[PDB]
Amino acid sequence: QHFTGYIEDGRGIFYSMQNTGGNLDPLVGIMAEEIDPAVSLGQVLEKALASENDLISELTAVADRIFLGWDDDGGKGYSASLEFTIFAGSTITNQRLDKFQPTYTTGSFQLILGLNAPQVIGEVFASLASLEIKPEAHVQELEIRLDKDTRYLTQHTRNLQPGDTFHALVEPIGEAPLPRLRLTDSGGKPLAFGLIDQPGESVELNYTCDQDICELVVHVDGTVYRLLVGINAPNLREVGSSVFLESDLVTVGLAVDQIVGVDQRSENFSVVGTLKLSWHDPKLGFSPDQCGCTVKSFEDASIRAVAGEINLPLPSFSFYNQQGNRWSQNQVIFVTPDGRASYFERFTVTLQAPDFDFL
Amino acid sequence: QHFTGYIEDGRGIFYSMQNTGGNLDPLVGIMAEEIDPAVSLGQVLEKALASENDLISELTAVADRIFLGWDDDGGKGYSASLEFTIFAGSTITNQRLDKFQPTYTTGSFQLILGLNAPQVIGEVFASLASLEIKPEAHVQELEIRLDKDTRYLTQHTRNLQPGDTFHALVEPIGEAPLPRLRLTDSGGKPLAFGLIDQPGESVELNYTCDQDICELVVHVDGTVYRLLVGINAPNLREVGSSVFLESDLVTVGLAVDQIVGVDQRSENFSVVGTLKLSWHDPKLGFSPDQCGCTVKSFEDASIRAVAGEINLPLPSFSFYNQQGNRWSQNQVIFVTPDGRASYFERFTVTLQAPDFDFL
To answer: Which residues bind Ca(2+) 4 (chains A, B) (predicted)?
Structure first.
């Protein structure tokens, strides 16, 4: 038996171990009971005491009832270890030093089962199929505006575990023509289409995945309007608990430290400042076991020697009204395991001022 | 059985799978009938509905009659999969997000046959030879001008599947001496020559390939005139459906954003602008499965770290009348799977003005 897959934030697959990428800390146990235990595991995290002196021991006490016994991963020394004589989720840990906060992790989890065999630590005894039902509560709404040019809209979703549904509904705010919608694959191949009804005030699109990875894109074509997106929402008729779209939103910040000079006759000026770009990416994460550290640092031209191997897109800016060269003396990007990256820069640039009025 | 080869745009080789380079999406099926089905497959693409809600299901319905059953590739999870108990072309898909448009693909397709064997998914049961006839309709005309110096002309064709012919005919517009013509290999070795007739107003050249790849070059020597080039054109006597020569035509564009200064006494000036170079190359293509993405981006000096491994020629410009250095602050090239590449640049340069007249 050798089965591998991804585990979402705070999800438990019901059925040793090894994380194939991310920050996953495995937690494997076999229990005969079918009573939903992920509620308590989230509840174990939820009522995080103001003093974590309960937190170190609560995982030992509560997990006794959950499975055949409390079973921590072990970290680098052991990815996971389970044994017994007859919900593979992410154990609640902390990953930072400045402030103490617990949460669950994610990644790509490999599961290895050896039945009555010391070899691990023919017949398919594993039965990777589980058919377990895990109803969700994901629902979202967006206020989407049409444009004079390029009147098509696209978005993104999260990776879907098999069996998930996707209800799509768009209802215009008022007196706005129905636009075209289409669900395709992130590569570009199409998977489903929306069939409207006689009422005409809404559109319907349905699809259910059956593959190991389901990355979905919603096309809205008009070449303002309201669009609803849900996950596992039967009776969606009549802002959920969590978000249901990915993130590429970049936060910015600039500051001015000096004004080197002003040149009236040539209409330009120079400043010495600093720049801050920061965003979120589920990729480029890392467990604290690969380095033994909590933040990773890159500088100068080694930054160009990182992402190309990983092939993940980075933002690239440009001073629009700059004349000549920009002397930047420091560049640094700090990465935190969950994915947050902050990019700083210190520069000295000459810009153009075209609103000089000498009247 | 293990046979590999290239598949052109909208071509079907009559006889699992794997693409060895390009954007090929395999589509393999075995049918006893010999009635030409590629017409319908092109017709399936042709009448692309304004709403593709028919497109998702049309491939399922129509392909039922075509072969032993509709058989999609599966993408990354499966290159292709065929099974049965007793026209390997490119399935019509889409590969972009900004606008929805269907077409066929191309590449290098590997075909693997396992007869009554689960191993795939001695005796040559495959019979790669097919001897099938696929008449074409390729015909072209060019208006070629002679030069005071370097009065020889060369061109290029497309890769030819075996058995193709190549009729060549050149007839001068009027009162122009007959020039020399010669068909060689892209490496440089010669393959065929043109023998003229008593009339003298035209030349004739014929060649038929028998190799797995046929890359041909037409030499026209004169060290204006009309030259005709065709493919599979018996009775070519008395601008076809498609082109029959390759492309290296570069589109350009420049814009001016600022005029930094003017120096009357030294006769020069400076500008801050932007540049756009874009062209077509059947190489450097890629399937949307290698990355899961639709456009690839490179910047700065990593661009010099791409093509050399692939060994494909790139244009290189130069500001002819520039004095000193050119401070370019951004360089970026975007690549689309079919081959289109667009190169942008933002620069600040000092140029020379030699037509100053102070009279």
So the answer is: 267, 354, 356
Query: What tokens appear for B355 in the block?
Result: 């037509």
CB B134 within 8 A of CB B35: no
Q: How big is the CA angle at B307 (ends B304 and B310), to the nearest 5 degrees?
A: 150
Q: How many contiguous H segments (helices) and E segments (strands) does chain B have?
A: 3, 18
User: Which residues of chain B are at the A interface, by a Cβ-Cβ cutoff of 8 Å?
Assistant: 51-53, 55-56, 75-77, 93-100, 258, 260-261, 272, 288-289, 291-294, 297, 299-302, 327, 329-330, 332, 346, 348
Interface mutation target, options A203, A219, A323, A356, chain B, most CBs of B under 10 Å: A323
- The encoded tokens of residue B104 equal 């066929």
What's B204's DSSP letter?
Answer: E
Between chains, do A189 and B96 touch, taking CB under 8 Å as contact?
A: no
Is the dihedral angle over the CA atoms A341, A342, A348, A351 positive or is it negative? positive
The DSSP code sequence of A293-309 is -S-EEEEGGGGGGTHHH
Which residues of chain A approach chain B closer than 8 Å at the C-beta? 150, 152, 154, 180, 182, 184-195, 211-212, 215, 217, 219, 221, 223, 266, 304, 308, 311, 313, 316, 318-319, 321-326, 352
- Alpha carbon distance B12, B35 (integer Å): 13
> Around A69, how many Cα atoms within 13 Å sit in the side-chain half-sphere?
8
Q: Which residues pair with B31 in a beta bridge?
A: none
Amino acid code (one letter) for B209? C
Distance CA A25, CA A72 (A): 9
Task: Give the Cα separation of A225 and A262 in Å (integer).
Answer: 48
Mutate to test the interface with A, among B53, B270, B294, B335 (most CBs of A within 10 A): B53
3-state secondary structure of B169: strand
Alpha carbons A343 and A294: distance in angstroms, whole number: 17
What chain A residue is nearest to B76 in terms of C-alpha separation?
A187
Whether residue A188 and residue B96 make contact (CB cut-off 8 A), yes or no, is yes
CA A350, distance to chain mean position in Å, is 38
**Break sites following residues in chain B (C–N > 2.5 A):** 15, 86, 121, 223, 238
Angle ∠(A330,A331,A336) on CA atoms, nearest 5 = 135
User: Do the Cβ atoms of A3 and A126 come closer than 8 Å?
Assistant: yes
Distances (CA, A) of A36 to A13, A32, A135, A231: 11, 12, 12, 20
Q: Which residue has the tokens 């002003």?
A: A262
Which residues are within 8 A (CB) of B16 and not within 5 positions of it... i.e. 6 or more apart?
Answer: B28, B78, B79, B80, B81, B82, B112, B120, B121
The residues, any chain, with a CB within 8 Å of residue B274's CB and separated by 6 or more, are: B254, B255, B257, B344, B345, B346, B347
Residue A102: name the closest of A113, A114, A91 by CA: A91
End-to-end Cα spacing for chain B? 83
* Cα distance between residue B273 and residue B349, in whole Å: 9
What are the backbone angles phi and psi of residue A309, rounded to the nearest 5°?
A: -60, -40
Q: What is the DSSP string of A40-80?
A: HHHHHHHT--SSTTTHHHHHHHHHHHHSSS-----TTS-S-
Quote the tokens at residue B50: 């304004």
Answer yes or no: are the C-beta atoms of A10 and A42 closer than 8 Å: yes
